[PDB]
Ligand binder design. Structure first.
Ligand SMILES: [Cl-]
Ligand SMILES: [Cl-]
Lengths: 261, 261
């Protein structure tokens, strides 16, 4: 009679979606479609990407923007290549040789989030300058950092001007507001089951001495609050077998000493 | 260096999405936008809804179709009312009195999936006949079953003709094919991390003597395979703290004696 599996599955998908959301930075979604959903070559830097939560969010937003593209898109992960006619050129061309469409987009991805062979870097800027010369082939170099030598080498040797996206540092208040949004669900709007779930969350968050409120006070000091909350919360949802078991965990079992494990 | 949290969160959202997918029944998505995204009153029956997996899927598809509607949408859950000027009329009108838009859509939801006061049923068909008389107000009665007295009472007393949607019974082969699709992920297309994950799944499913293949043989006989697989799989993803831990569980720990718990 009380289909918790329907709630469970929908809550798990929304919590997933909520975490990967980049709505706190509306300027980003527009910045992506502008640079990614075109036939213009560009190099994008993502600075102040200080959290795995942020990286996952940017990545999904990139992943989706490339899905909108009505031209062949190829992915090359440059991490394994650099951090260690040409090897790279041969590999890029093999991928691009897909007789899918006349126009192609090569998306080169480089991630330096825990901050590089000079010889390997030059070989890369060489492939990039050849794709610059090619009409029908466009490149999107996406670098995730926070690099110094990279920016200066890419600027000096190429004709494509690079753009930079500064990931906003949230205030404790902004962070708290967005962490609460993360565990608020919007599926089956108007339903008493969603009303019960969201009312309990809202009221416990406003009750200073509650497990949920106390848990959130810790997230103010914790370095990666979105991930700590996401892990703790997916566990309570997954481990609960009934709707009442879920409410009981939010009210009585959610503590930093209990979740995640 | 190997951001499993990015994979974990994306895999959890996709597994969520995959479960709630109604792509196996493309005729349904079109049937919904036709009947729900209009200003015409209609009564829809969902017969042969034999699984909680199916119900969750139909519900989300309904939930999304109503999001497309550019007119005020109100939800009334008739379950609590019937199974037990008028009480109902007063409540429906209170909701509809939202000074949001001139036109309103009342979505009445009734679920009889484990199969009703005659007095309560008449009161409902009375509210429905008054909304029929009202221009600017449309109703969408959605009944989920498998009812006999309901269909005949709704047909006899109302001017709105009812439609029926027969949920297709999947063959063992269809079921197996779709259960495999459920645990195949499409985020970060082209990435070696997604390639590793999907190759392991594909190869283990083809290896008759593997944990994954043996697990799937049980799903052929199990009455609710999508839910049993979803629960077992969200656990392995959630409980794993590294990418290697995940692969180890799929290869060595996934059994009917171990998952879900
Ligand atoms: Cl975080
Ligand atoms: Cl099922």
């Amino acid at each position: 009679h009380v289909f918790y599996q329907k709630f469970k599955s929908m809550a798990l998908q929304e919590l997933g979606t909520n975490y990967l959301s980049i709505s706190y930075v509306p300027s980003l979604s527009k910045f992506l479609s502008k640079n990614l959903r075109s036939m213009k070559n560009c190099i994008v830097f993502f600075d102040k990407v200080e959290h795995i939560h942020q990286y996952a969010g940017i990545d999904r937003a990139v992943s989706e923007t490339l899905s909108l593209v009505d031209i062949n898109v190829v992915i090359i992960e440059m991490n394994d290549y650099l951090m260690k006619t040409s090897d790279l050129m041969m590999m890029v061309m093999r991928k691009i040789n897909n007789d899918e469409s006349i126009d192609h987009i090569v998306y080169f991805k480089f991630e330096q989030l825990d901050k590089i062979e000079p010889s390997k870097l030059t070989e890369f800027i060489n492939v990039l300058s050849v794709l610059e010369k090619s009409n029908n082939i466009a490149f999107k170099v996406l670098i995730y950092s926070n690099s110094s030598l990279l920016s200066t080498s890419l600027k000096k040797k190429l004709n494509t001007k690079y753009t930079v996206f500064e990931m906003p540092i949230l205030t404790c208040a902004q962070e708290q507001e967005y962490l609460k949004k993360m565990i608020k669900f919007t599926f089956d709007s108007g339903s008493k089951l969603l009303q019960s779930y969201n009312s309990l969350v809202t009221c416990q968050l406003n009750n200073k001495e509650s497990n949920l409120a106390i848990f959130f006070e810790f997230l103010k000091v914790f370095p990666h609050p979105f991930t700590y909350l996401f892990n703790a919360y997916t566990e309570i949802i997954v481990q609960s077998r009934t709707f009442d078991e879920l409410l009981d965990k939010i009210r009585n079992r959610l503590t930093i000493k209990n979740y995640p494990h």
